[PDB]
Design a protein around this nucleic acid. Structure first.
Lengths: 61, 132, 139, 189, 314, 65
RNA sequence: AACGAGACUCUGGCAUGCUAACUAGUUACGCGACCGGUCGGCGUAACUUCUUAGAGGGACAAGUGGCGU
RNA sequence: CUCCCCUGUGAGGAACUACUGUCUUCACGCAGAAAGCGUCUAGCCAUGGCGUUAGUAUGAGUGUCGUGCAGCCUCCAGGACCCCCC
């Protein structure tokens, strides 16, 4: 299933070369579920991310 | 990154400390105050120092500043501090006390005090933190 | 009845002369539609179409532009005519209609009443350009 | 009224996604007459989030060496490309830019992890601005590679690649590289 | 038996309103000199949405305009400015007829007489300058005129022998006599710098205020201390009512209309209802102007606006 | 500042062993020219004039002269 | 507290406020031309917006709102 | 344990020719894959690039033939609904 996500906070930048941003995800379905997630490119708080695999969790690079 | 030199902050400290009555919370006000009060070369120095005199005043009206001592804010903090509620917090019709405290008073012949109330001793003994 | 301004972009300078008239607006001896990039036509009439034609009906602007590049000069005439209709409305008209003109021109493009301070830096030795440098090799 | 290239209408177009609604421009205000505003959008972070999308497609079309400094080559080419698009599909050519941006952008992408020389990638997910940017990249590059020598006009070939990027066909070089990214994302997970 | 109400708000300005000057000849128009270098001509249309609309914005200045005063006639105006220039303006054609230089510091204050030929100004150069309508300076007083800046200069419109009252940052209020160019009085009541001196059309009552926060009412003809009013913060502006005998003090958070006979504060004017921005300093009152009408108050703010006050009489 | 504030001198002594070069740097003090003391002060230096003693006011006094 | 960093000098951006310009132009008026304008065409008074360059102003994280012992 | 709002392809009709848009068949050029097989590179090692499979297997579109697919009416279904469970 395809899902949507909301940015609650920006925590740090994960990467070897300092590539990924490690961001915190609310679900736009009004659910309270909170998952950390890796995102590439620029991110500011409040943005919406589209997840193709929505059950996956964030690991440290 | 914009950060003030030793010159900037030291100068604004002494300027404020001497002239505190002449400065005001406006920038250009104290800018022209410092074109007079002190002697500074150039511009970018002047402007910065004045900016800090100002900033430091906006922190002064909040309360005591770590760097400066003025008798005027010593006096305003003599007003602010001095306070008292209509009655003391040390006045209670009933003050509660442990049997032993009552004993210690009984040594001093005060076992006759009216306001006291003897409260039940706590039965378990654990005042200590469970080590580990 | 007479008001004068100048546009600025980089090294390009415009000079706009506003007199009471039929609404003739010409640039260094030719109308708005004879200018070199015709692709850049629409950027020139932008305040016009924004301000309405009624407010240009009573304003005759002769524009003299020299300096800079081709593209810059159209920004220059843009600047000149915009600054012209704002600075003319101050002296020969009220401040209400100047506020109308200004509230219309500002929310679209900030470059209408202001110029970009930015201009070319200095290439320095050790490189082909401002920052850019020559290659180096070890081994 | 504000009409793009004198014949178009910006305010009638539509955005179907929430992530790309906050970034993609030319809906409410930003709509202009001409692409070249010579403004500074690289001045501060995300200040280039707000510049007109047509200008955004415009800026990226100078991207190879001889065409580099010449911007007007593009506001020429973007001019004839739109006027071509309207003839084929028959819709507002600025709907076709929206759909190509939305579809061409990646979703998930891979970040290289390992030691140099050994590529082992892990799947993460694209940020909205990054989606827009990569998408447009893909559009301009697809247009170049497709138009190098077929003797196609870049007007013709970009209208091609754009309409095809909008429909979802594998014709577009864009949709191709996207589909590779998402598939590698699948490989890793 | 009176109360005061907020009527309208005037935005012509991108910055502070330094001094507001009203006129008897035209109760309809005001002259507002602002921190944005502009002297705005205010037309009161007294409509529903807007209480007033700007008319003529005058730029002669490379810097801020500290004070403005009008002629008893609807034409000429005068403006002091920190770049060190005083100027004679025509409100009709919107151009500069005469320019006044010879100050090496800012022009802090300027006073135009009731007779409309004289000019008396004072500056951060610690100078009180006498100007003529043609630009020529008569007499420069270095006399001990002050040991600090001259913040305000005001003429006295009285039948008794003419007097000019200037207030310095040296805490002195000095009184001077015209045509002898002489220093006739030294008034010392003060703690802290002085901001504004006002002189009532009576000529008898002059009010001065400053950082001390206490409004000082002095007797000009006799040369005697009269009254002391207690208040908070800083007095920025002070203006006397021509017909109502009310002394309006301008302090930053609040304006105070004083009744001098009964020593009663009439109304205290401050309004902010917002809870989120309440941590901020309430915008100061930079100037004050009383129209010759007596009902209408015009006040400048640090909110870059001109707010007006109207009198409800019962 | 080092331009107008200091004076540098370099010389060569010529001796059996070789030449010894030498450098002498001298710094001048500040304010009015006595043939020394270059007038314009260091851009760093900040000089504060002590407040001139002001009489503390008692009761308002009006003096006519 | 002292040197180094900064400050400083040199260059660019601001000034329809000032000081002015026949060795830079502008506006205005004449003559000139070709169909009221177009013209680097020719000359006189008008002034500094343009064009120069001096004086000095201007920015100090300043103002408001958030993160911060 | 339902009922009834919108989606489907299961059956009957008009229409089907005229209307428009999509799947059939032929000429057309354009992108264009892999199981694998080899090679090269990460010290050793493909989970990568590049060669060969092949310009195959394919898919997006323009013009030919369809007597198609339809759009307009019904149900048979499927999902939003409810309930219910909490």
């Amino acid at each position: 299933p395809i899902k949507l996500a909301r940015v609650t906070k920006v925590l740090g930048r994960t990467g070897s070369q300092g590539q990924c941003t490690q961001v915190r995800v609310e679900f736009m379905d009004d659910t309270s579920r909170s998952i950390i997630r890796n995102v590439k490119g620029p991110v500011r708080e409040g943005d919406v991310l589209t997840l193709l695999e929505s059950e996956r969790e964030a690991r440290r690079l | 990154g914009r950060v003030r030199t030793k010159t900037v902050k030291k100068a604004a400290r002494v300027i404020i400390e001497k002239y505190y009555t002449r400065l005001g919370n406006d920038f250009h006000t104290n800018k022209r105050v410092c074109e007079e009060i002190a002697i500074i070369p150039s511009k970018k120095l002047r402007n910065k120092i004045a900016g800090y005199v100002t900033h430091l005043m906006k922190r002064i009206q909040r309360g005591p500043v770590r760097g400066i001592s003025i008798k005027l804010q010593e006096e305003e903090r003599e007003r602010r501090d001095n306070y008292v509620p209509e009655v003391s917090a040390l006045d209670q019709e009933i003050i509660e006390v442990d049997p032993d405290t009552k004993e210690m008073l009984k040594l001093l012949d005060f076992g006759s005090l009216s306001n006291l109330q003897v409260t039940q001793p706590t039965v378990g003994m654990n005042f200590k933190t469970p080590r580990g | 009845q007479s008001v004068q301004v100048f546009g600025r972009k980089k090294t390009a300078t415009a000079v706009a002369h506003c007199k009471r008239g039929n609404g003739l607006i010409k640039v260094n001896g030719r109308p708005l539609e004879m200018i070199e990039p015709r692709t850049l036509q629409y950027k020139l009439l932008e305040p016009v179409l924004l301000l309405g034609k009624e407010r240009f009906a009573g304003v005759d602007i002769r524009v003299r532009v020299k300096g800079g590049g081709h593209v810059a000069q159209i920004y220059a005439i843009r600047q000149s005519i915009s600054k012209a209709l704002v600075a003319y409305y101050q002296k020969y008209v009220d401040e209400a209609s100047k506020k109308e003109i200004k509230d219309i021109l500002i929310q679209y493009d900030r470059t209408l009443l202001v110029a970009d301070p930015r201009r070319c830096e200095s290439k320095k030795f050790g490189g082909p350009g401002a920052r850019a440098r020559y290659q180096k090799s070890y081994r | 009224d504000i009409k793009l290239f004198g014949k178009w209408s910006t305010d009638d177009v539509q955005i179907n996604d929430i992530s790309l609604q906050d970034y993609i421009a030319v809906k409410e205000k930003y709509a202009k007459y001409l692409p070249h505003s010579a403004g500074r959008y690289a001045a501060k972070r995300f200040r280039k989030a707000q510049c007109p999308i047509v200008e955004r497609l415009t800026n990226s079309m100078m991207m190879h060496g001889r065409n580099n400094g010449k911007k007007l080559m593009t506001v020429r080419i973007v001019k004839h490309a739109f006027e071509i698009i309207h003839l084929l599909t028959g819709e507002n050519p600025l709907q076709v830019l929206v759909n190509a941006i939305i579809n061409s952008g990646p979703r998930e992408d891979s970040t290289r992890i390992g030691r140099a020389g050994t590529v082992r990638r892990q799947a993460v997910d694209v940020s909205p601005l990054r989606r827009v940017n990569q998408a447009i990249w893909l559009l301009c590059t697809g247009a170049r590679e497709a138009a190098f020598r077929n003797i196609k006009t870049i007007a013709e070939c970009l209208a091609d690649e754009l309409i095809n990027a909008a429909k979802g066909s594998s014709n577009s070089y864009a949709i191709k590289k996207k589909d590779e990214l998402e598939r590698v994302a699948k490989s890793n997970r | 038996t009176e109360q005061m109400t907020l009527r309208g708000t005037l935005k012509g300005h991108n910055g502070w309103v330094t001094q507001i000057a009203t006129t008897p000849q035209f109760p309809d128009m005001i002259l507002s000199a602002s921190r944005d270098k502009t002297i705005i001509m205010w037309k009161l249309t007294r409509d529903e949405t807007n209480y007033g609309i700007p008319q003529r914005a005058l730029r002669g200045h490379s810097h801020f305009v500290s004070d403005v005063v009008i002629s008893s006639d609807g034409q000429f105006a005068l403006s002091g400015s920190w770049d060190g220039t005083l100027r004679l303006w025509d409100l009709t054609t919107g151009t500069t007829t005469r320019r006044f230089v010879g100050h090496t510091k800012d022009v802090l204050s300027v006073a135009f007489s009731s007779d409309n030929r004289q000019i008396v100004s004072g500056s951060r150069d610690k100078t009180i300058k006498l100007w003529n309508t043609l630009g020529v300076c008569k007499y420069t007083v270095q006399d001990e005129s002050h040991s600090e800046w001259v913040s305000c200069v005001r003429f006295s419109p009285n039948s008794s022998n003419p007097i000019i009252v200037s207030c310095g940052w040296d805490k002195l209020v000095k009184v001077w006599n015209l045509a002898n160019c002489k220093l006739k009085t030294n008034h010392i009541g003060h703690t802290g710098y002085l901001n504004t001196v006002t002189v009532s059309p009576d000529g008898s009552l002059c009010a001065s205020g400053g950082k001390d926060g206490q409004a000082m009412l002095w007797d000009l003809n006799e040369g005697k201390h009269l009254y002391t009013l207690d208040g908070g913060d800083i007095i920025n502006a002070l203006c006397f009512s021509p017909n109502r005998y009310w002394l309006c003090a301008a302090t930053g958070p609040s304006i105070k209309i004083w009744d001098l006979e009964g020593k009663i504060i009439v109304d205290e004017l401050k309004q902010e209802v917002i809870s989120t921005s309440s941590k901020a300093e309430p915008p100061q009152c930079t100037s004050l102007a009383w129209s010759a009408d007596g009902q209408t108050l015009f006040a400048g703010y640090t909110d870059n606006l001109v707010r007006v006050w109207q009198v409800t009489i019962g | 500042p080092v331009n107008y504030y200091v004076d540098t001198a370099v010389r060569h002594v010529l001796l059996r062993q070789g030449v010894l070069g030498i450098k002498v740097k001298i710094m001048l003090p500040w304010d009015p020219t006595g043939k020394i003391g270059p007038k314009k002060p260091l851009p760093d230096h900040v000089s504060i004039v002590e407040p001139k003693d002001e009489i503390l006011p008692t009761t308002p006094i009006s003096e006519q002269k």
